[PDB]
Structures are given as C-alpha cells and as structure tokens.
Enzyme design. Structure first.
Site, short mmCIF file in Angstrom:
data_model
loop_
_atom_site.label_atom_id
_atom_site.label_comp_id
_atom_site.label_asym_id
_atom_site.label_seq_id
_atom_site.Cartn_x
_atom_site.Cartn_y
_atom_site.Cartn_z
N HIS A 108 0.79 -1.22 0.00
CA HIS A 108 0.00 0.00 0.00
C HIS A 108 0.84 1.28 0.00
O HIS A 108 0.32 2.34 -0.38
CB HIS A 108 -0.96 -0.03 1.18
CG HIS A 108 -0.35 0.31 2.49
ND1 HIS A 108 -0.32 -0.58 3.54
CD2 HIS A 108 0.23 1.45 2.93
CE1 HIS A 108 0.27 0.00 4.57
NE2 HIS A 108 0.62 1.22 4.23
N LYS B 251 -12.68 -12.43 15.73
CA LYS B 251 -13.89 -12.00 16.43
C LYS B 251 -13.97 -10.48 16.54
O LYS B 251 -15.08 -9.93 16.56
CB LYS B 251 -13.98 -12.62 17.82
CG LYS B 251 -15.45 -12.66 18.31
CD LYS B 251 -15.83 -11.47 19.22
CE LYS B 251 -17.30 -11.53 19.64
NZ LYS B 251 -17.95 -10.19 19.65
N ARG B 252 -12.84 -9.79 16.65
CA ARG B 252 -12.90 -8.34 16.76
C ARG B 252 -12.97 -7.67 15.40
O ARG B 252 -13.33 -6.48 15.32
CB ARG B 252 -11.71 -7.81 17.59
CG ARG B 252 -11.83 -8.14 19.10
CD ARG B 252 -11.13 -9.44 19.47
NE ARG B 252 -11.77 -10.25 20.52
CZ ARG B 252 -11.53 -10.18 21.83
NH1 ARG B 252 -10.64 -9.32 22.31
NH2 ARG B 252 -12.17 -11.00 22.67
N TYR B 253 -12.66 -8.40 14.33
CA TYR B 253 -12.86 -7.95 12.95
C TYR B 253 -13.88 -8.84 12.25
O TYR B 253 -13.62 -9.43 11.19
CB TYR B 253 -11.53 -7.91 12.19
CG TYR B 253 -10.64 -6.78 12.62
CD1 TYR B 253 -10.86 -5.49 12.18
CD2 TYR B 253 -9.59 -7.00 13.50
CE1 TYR B 253 -10.05 -4.44 12.58
CE2 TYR B 253 -8.76 -5.95 13.91
CZ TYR B 253 -9.00 -4.67 13.45
OH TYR B 253 -8.18 -3.64 13.86
N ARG B 254 -15.04 -8.97 12.87
CA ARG B 254 -16.22 -9.47 12.18
C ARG B 254 -16.40 -8.72 10.86
O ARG B 254 -16.14 -7.52 10.77
CB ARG B 254 -17.43 -9.31 13.09
CG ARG B 254 -18.50 -10.38 13.02
CD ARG B 254 -19.80 -9.77 12.47
NE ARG B 254 -20.92 -10.71 12.49
CZ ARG B 254 -21.10 -11.69 11.60
NH1 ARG B 254 -20.24 -11.88 10.61
NH2 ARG B 254 -22.15 -12.49 11.71
N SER C 275 3.20 2.55 8.93
CA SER C 275 2.87 1.46 8.03
C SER C 275 4.08 1.10 7.17
O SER C 275 4.95 1.94 6.90
CB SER C 275 1.69 1.86 7.14
OG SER C 275 1.94 3.09 6.47
#
Lengths: 12, 8, 238
Positions: free
Chosen positions: C44, C160-163, C188
């Site tokens: 990126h 789970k925290r990035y459903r 980054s």
C-alpha cells in the site's frame, strides 16, 4: 482522510 | 546468522 | 506510534525510513533491511507512486532530523508488489525494494532475519512495533523513532474483533485488548519484530487496523512467514 478507518495508520 | 537468508 | 517511547541509536538497525520526493520530500513508510540490497515494506505504500526514481531510502536514522540535502541515501532500482495485492484489508500487503547501491552493514544498520517456515510453532513473547508515525490520531510525523511492545493475539481472537473481515492465515494481529499502544499514521510498512532465543525475527509488516490503538481492535500485519517463499522467489532470482 477520514474515508477508511481500517487505513488511519497508512499514508493517504 | 539466520536460517533463511538472502544471498547478496 | 501510539503510547510508545523513544528508541536509542542502534536499537532497530533494520528499520529504514522511506521518503518520497514529489511534490515534497516527506516520510512515507517504514521498512526493514532484509538483505544487502533489499527492503521489505508494504504494498500500500506505493499507491500513486509510479516511478522508483522518486523514492529515497534512509538507513541508520534515529531522528527524522538528521537528513537534509547532503545526507546519504539509497536509490530504489525496482518496486516489487505482490501480484495479488489489491488493498491492505484484502491481504497480500507485501513489497520489496531492490536498491541500486549495496547497503554496508554496521552498528546503525543491519538486516533482520526472516522467520523459518519450520518455526510457526514458535509462540513469540517479546514483540515490538517501531516507527516515526503519529502518537495519536490527528498528529504529525515524529522526529525520533518510537517503539512500543505489543502482544500477539491469536487469529481466532482477531477474527472475532474484525467481524466482517476475513482474517486470513497470511495475516497476524497484535494489540492490547485495553487499547493504548499501536501503530498509527506513518508507521505502516514498518517492521513488527519479535526477539526470541537470542535473535530478532521479522514477524509482521504493519499493514492495516481499525483506527489507532483502539480498544479491542488490534493492528493487522502481513504474516511474513507465509511469504518467505515469495520473498525468496524475488530476491534469489537467477
């Protein structure tokens, strides 16, 4: 910028 | 001195 | 870097600062020396960078100060993006810089080892993320390279925290459920380095994350061990 919060740590 | 290394 | 402290000269000799020159000369991304002409950074970082001639790689830097017009740098001969990369969130966020010059190693600049495909059975306890990035949202680039120690989380807990995002095998997450310490704008492409058993290994590339050091939202990193073959393909080419 802020369009995507998944990119706050990328440049831009 | 690394097991995976990039030859110069 | 959110919630971090200052590094000392020599502490992260593999950390580079990647600059662009047009329109301005500014800091763009982190990156890691992995061989004597090879920088490993994020795909990126090069959106709308369409020529390597505008890139400067600066090694041995502690302070973003230290540079101006007569400071040495390495020119970038070739930009190598992973062929499947579309966007950070989608994975494959990995890129190599083939430098024009050869990097001489020393106390302010050495390579970091990549992981060994037969060591994903190592659970790393001692991981840091480094960078000149923002200390908070709505900040600016830091003068002095920052550091922050961060715990890996399992990809199951990360998912789970990035459903609503597929957290693939080729990503790895790290953060405090508390929040409080993380990468942010400018870090980054930087390394995510883990000391283990005497040696430092390049475990992740800072790629994406919900905000910065946000509660229950650990940063997401390219899992470098899943790209070692890809790296060896490009750097050992005949």
């Amino acid at each position: 910028t802020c369009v995507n919060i998944m990119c706050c740590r990328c440049p831009x | 001195e690394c097991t995976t290394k990039i030859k110069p | 870097i959110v919630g971090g402290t200052a590094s000392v000269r020599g502490e992260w000799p593999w950390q580079v600062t990647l600059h662009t020159t047009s329109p301005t000369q500014r800091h763009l991304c982190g990156g890691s020396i992995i061989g004597n002409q090879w920088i490993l950074t994020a795909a990126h970082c090069f959106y709308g960078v369409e020529s390597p001639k505008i890139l400067r790689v600066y090694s041995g830097i502690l302070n973003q100060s230290e540079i101006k017009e007569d400071t040495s740098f390495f020119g970038v001969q070739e930009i190598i993006i992973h062929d499947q990369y579309k966007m950070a969130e989608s994975g494959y966020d990995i890129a190599l810089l083939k430098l024009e010059t050869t990097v001489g190693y020393g106390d302010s600049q050495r390579p970091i080892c990549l992981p060994s495909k037969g060591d994903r059975n190592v659970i790393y306890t001692d991981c840091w993320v480094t960078g000149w990035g923002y200390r908070k949202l709505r900040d600016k680039i830091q003068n002095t390279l920052q550091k922050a120690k961060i715990p890996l989380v399992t990809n199951e807990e990360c998912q789970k925290r990035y459903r609503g995002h597929k957290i693939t095998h080729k990503m790895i997450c790290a953060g405090y459920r508390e929040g409080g310490k993380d990468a942010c704008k400018g870090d980054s492409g930087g390394p995510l380095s883990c000391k283990h058993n005497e040696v430092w290994h390049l475990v992740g590339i800072t790629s994406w994350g919900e905000g910065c050091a946000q509660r229950e939202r650990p940063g997401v990193y390219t899992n470098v061990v899943e790209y070692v073959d890809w790296i060896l393909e490009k750097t050992q080419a005949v």
